[PDB]
Amino acid sequence: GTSSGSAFSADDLMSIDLAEQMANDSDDSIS
Amino acid sequence: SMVGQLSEGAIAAIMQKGDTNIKPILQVINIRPITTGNSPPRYRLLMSDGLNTLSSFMLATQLNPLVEEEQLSSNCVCQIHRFIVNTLKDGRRVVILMELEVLKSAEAVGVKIGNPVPYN
């Protein structure tokens, strides 16, 4: 409510990368 | 009402209940890139469900062309078909949009719908 949103550092971005890649890898069990 | 187009309460359902099976219709309010030298950009989105906004939405990298070719842009209305919620080391949670469909272009909507308040 006070700004455009807390920022995401390199470590946070690596975690987001991993989360999306884990979803992609799980898709390989069905496609 | 224009808010009749949006899935009011979907943000609270995602945040409070962790419901990942809904397919809510949301409005993009703003898009901001997050850049790094060797990495593709990561697009962060301020989204609205007509009741709340939330600034911690993140676009899956495979959907970057939608932003780069301007189909996904501020004011457009989209239906989220697949998303996941990820918790960061500091306790913040981000909502990663994996699959979506742009239902109405920014130029066909024209403005922010309603008067949503920030969820956090």
Residue numbers in the entry:
A (entry chain B): 533 to 563
B (entry chain A): 0 to 119
Question: What did the original publication write about this model?
Answer:
The heterotrimeric Replication protein A (RPA) is the ubiquitous eukaryotic single-stranded DNA (ssDNA) binding protein and participates in nearly all aspects of DNA metabolism, especially DNA damage response. The N-terminal OB domain of the RPA70 subunit (RPA70N) is a major protein-protein interaction element for RPA and binds to more than 20 partner proteins. Its primary role is to mediate protein–protein interaction with its basic and hydrophobic groove and a side pocket, as first shown by a series of studies of RPA70N interacting with p53.
Several studies have demonstrated that MRE11 physically associates with RPA70N through a motif in the C-terminal region, and that this interaction is required for the correct localization of MRN to replication centers and for the S-phase checkpoint. We fused the RPA interacting sequence of MRE11 to RPA70N and crystallized the fusion protein in the P212121 space group with one molecule in the asymmetric unit. MRE11 residues (538–563) form a long helix with a short N-terminal loop situated in the basic groove. Positively charged RPA residues R91, R43, R41, R81 and K88 interact with negatively charged D544, D549, E552, D559 and D543 from MRE11. Among these residues, D543 and D544 were previously shown to be important for RPA association. ITC titration showed that MRE11 binds to RPA70N with a KD of round 16.3 μM, whereas the triple mutation of the hydrophobic residues F540, L545 and I548 resulted in a KD value that was much higher than 100 μM. MRE11–FLAG with F540/L545/I548 triple mutation led to slightly worse colocalization, in agreement with its reduced binding to RPA in coimmunoprecipitation experiments.
